[PDB]
Amino acid sequence: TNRFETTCAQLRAQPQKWLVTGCAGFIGSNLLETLLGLDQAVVGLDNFATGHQHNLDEVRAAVTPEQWARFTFIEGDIRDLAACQRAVQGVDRVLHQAALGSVPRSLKDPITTNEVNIGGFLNMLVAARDAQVQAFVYAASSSTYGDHPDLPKVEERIGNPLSPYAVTKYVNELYADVFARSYGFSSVGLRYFNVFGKRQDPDGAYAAVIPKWTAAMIKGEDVVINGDGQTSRDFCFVENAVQANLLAAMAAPEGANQVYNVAYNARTTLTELFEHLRRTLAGQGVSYEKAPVYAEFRAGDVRHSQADIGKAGKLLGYEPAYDILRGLEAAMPWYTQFLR
C-alpha cells in the first residue's frame, strides 16, 4: 500500500476533526467530500465570494446522511479574525483553501486580493496558532516560481513574483516560515500546479483554461489559445491535490514546516490540451468541429511549467494516481451534466 491508503485507513479508524476553508469552492469541496467520506467531523468556512452553495449541495447528495451530519458549515470571512477563531475551535487539522485566485483578477483589483490572501491568511494562521491545532496545511501556488527559468521547478529555487496574486501566495509561505521561527508553529504549504477537476467554476470572467474551454466546446463557441499554443503546463487532477492535503496534514515533524510541489511532473501544451478535450468530449457525445483561434500572448504568462514532485514523494509518500488524460475522462462528465 502507498502512504495515502494507510492514511485513509488510519483516519477512518481514528477520526480527527478538520477545518476546510473555501469548502464551498473547487478544491475545498473536493476535500470536504473526501474527508466526510472517511467518517471525519469537518468544519467549513466560506463567504461564497467565488464558491457556490450548489457545490455544498452536491457534496451533501454524494455522502451518506450519517457523514453529512458531521459537517458544520460557517458562512464567514477569513478577513474577520473572530470568524477564523470560531472556525478553528476544537479543530485538530486545518486545510486552508480560502483565497481569491486569478492573477488577472489581482491585476484589476490588487487591494481586494491582498486583503483576502495575505490579511485573511494571517488571521487564519494566528487563529490556528492560538487554538493549538495539530496541523495547518495551506494552499500555495506555482506562481511563487515567478520568472525563474529552471525546469522542472524545484522547491528551493524560486524567482520574483510577477503579479499581485503571486505576491500574496509567496507571502503566505513567508509568514508560515516566520511563525515556525518565532512561535514554533508548524505548517505545510502546497504549491498547486494548475489543478482541474469537477466543480472548478466554468462561469465567471476569471475561469481556468480547462473549465472555460470545456464550456465553450459544449456550447460550440470559439476556443482561443493565448499565444502560439506550445505554452505548456503541469495540469494536476484534483484528486492528486486531495491526496497531498491529507498526507501533509498527517505528516510527522520532518514533513512539516515544509513547502511541496503538488502536480504530476508532466508537460502538456495548450494545443495538446485542446486535442485532449476534443477527444474526451467526443466520448460524451459532444461534437466540436471548430479549430482553436490563436491570438496574442497573455501578459505575465510563463511559457513552460513542469513540477519536480520528488520532495512530496520522498517526505509524504505522494503518489498521484491521475495523469491529465485520466482526470479529463473522469471530469468531463461532470461538465456535460452541469452545463446541460
Ligand X SMILES: NC(=O)c1ccc[n+]([C@@H]2O[C@H](COP(=O)([O-])OP(=O)(O)OC[C@H]3O[C@@H](n4cnc5c(N)ncnc54)[C@H](O)[C@@H]3O)[C@@H](O)[C@H]2O)c1
Footprint of ligand X (CB under 6 A): 21-22, 24-28, 45-51, 77-79, 97-101, 116, 120, 139, 141, 192, 194-195, 201, 208
Among 14-22, 155-163, 211-219, 323-331, which window interacts with a copy of itself (CB under 8 A)?
155-163
225 marked as binding residue? no
Among 86-94, 115-123, 135-143, 254-262, which window interacts with a copy of itself (CB under 8 A)?
115-123
Residue 45 has φ and ψ, to the nearest 5°, of -135, 125
State whether residue 92 is helix, strand or coil. Answer: coil
| 3-state DSSP of 265-289 | CCCEEHHHHHHHHHHHHHCCCCCCC
- Indicate which of ligand X, Cl ion, ligand UD2, none lies near residue 119 (CB less than 5 to 8 Å, by partner kind): Cl ion
Please count the other Cβ atoms lying within 10 Å of the Cβ belonging to residue 301.
Answer: 13
- Indicate which of ligand UD2, a copy of itself, Cl ion, none lies near residue 208 (CB less than 5 to 8 Å, by partner kind): ligand UD2
Say which amino acid occupies 63. V
Shortest spacing between CB 95 and ligand UD2, in angstroms: 16
Q: What angle do CA 116, 122, 125 make, to 5 degrees?
A: 125
Rg over CA atoms, the chain: 19
Q: Is 166 in the site for a copy of itself (CB under 8 A)?
A: yes
CB closer to a copy of itself out of 250 and 256? 256
Shortest spacing between CB 71 and ligand UD2, in angstroms: 25
Classify each residue of 165-198 as buried b or exposed e, where b means 16 or more C-beta atoms within 10 Å of its C-beta.
bbbbbbbbbebbeebeeeeebbbbbbbbbbbbbb
By rule CB under 8 A, what count of residues binds a copy of itself?
28
Residues annotated within the binding site for UDP-N-acetyl-alpha-D-galactosamine are: 102, 165, 194, 209, 212-213, 224, 226, 233, 298, 301
Active site residues: 165
